[PDB]
Amino acid sequence: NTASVVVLCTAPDEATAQDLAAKVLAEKLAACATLIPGATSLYYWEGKLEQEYVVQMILKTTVSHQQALLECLKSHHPYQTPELLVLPVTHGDTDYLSWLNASL
Amino acid sequence: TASVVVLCTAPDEATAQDLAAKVLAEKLAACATLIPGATSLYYWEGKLEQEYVVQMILKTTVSHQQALLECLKSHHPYQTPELLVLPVTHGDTDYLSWLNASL
Amino acid sequence: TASVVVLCTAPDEATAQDLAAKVLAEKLAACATLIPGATSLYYWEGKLEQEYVVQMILKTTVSHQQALLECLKSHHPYQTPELLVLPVTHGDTDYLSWLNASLR
Structure with missing residues (x-):
């Protein structure tokens, strides 16, 4: 399993939050x-x-994909300098982490 | 002992409410x-x-993460619920003392 | 100049806004x-x-974390409110540059 991380992003409205999520998810x-x-x-x-107003987003991914994710979010976010931060997962459930990786 | 924050997703309010009271009662x-x-x-x-889900955020110490995650997992209705642990690199000394003294 | 996120629990919205507006003014x-x-x-x-509580998520750097916590603590109505710092292991360059440039 590749190390997991948590990505924080904020969207200006629910439509934007909705399709930013759909996109990064579609593109794995x-x-x-x-x-x-x-x-x-x-x-x-x-x-x-x-x-x-903002929609707080919390995306789960791995350290090897974080940059790709970050750029995709930045590319489709309506703001010029959107909040894109990465937090490390120091520990997690093995089965869930395996599933996290499998998904990518 | 160093603190950590734990993220867990629950299906609804009753479940989120049940898991929390559970892990707090178990200390x-x-x-x-x-x-x-x-x-x-x-x-x-x-x-x-x-x-639609309920986002949970639990505070504990590194020495409890294993136990906390197991407790949350077994009592959780879902098959393999989200259970992630984030490290706390710093915090208010008095709040941290309280956190430790509470476990 | 490592970045970090600070979690703080406020009792109500007016309090959360006053704390926020304050630490932001203090840079x-x-x-x-x-x-x-x-x-x-x-x-x-x-x-x-x-x-009932309002979950606060503040963005700052390691250099200011201590001072940020001290300021939040002082104006926080609670005696010992939740003040936790989590590490940001990576983020978008433009956002980080903007974040850093916004601090005291």
């Missing part, structure tokens, strides 16, 4: 994705405090 | 956050599956 | 995602408590 760049709607994202954009 | 986790209204997407049989 | 965090509609279960004095 992620094993599965969880969408958490009704969130808010605060940050400074050009010296101004912005506050916008 | 295999210090706390658990539940976030309903989530959507999990994945391919099965070659088609795109979309299900 | 201790580059972005804060607030996820309402959650609950937290834990034992307190032997009793099982379950409370």
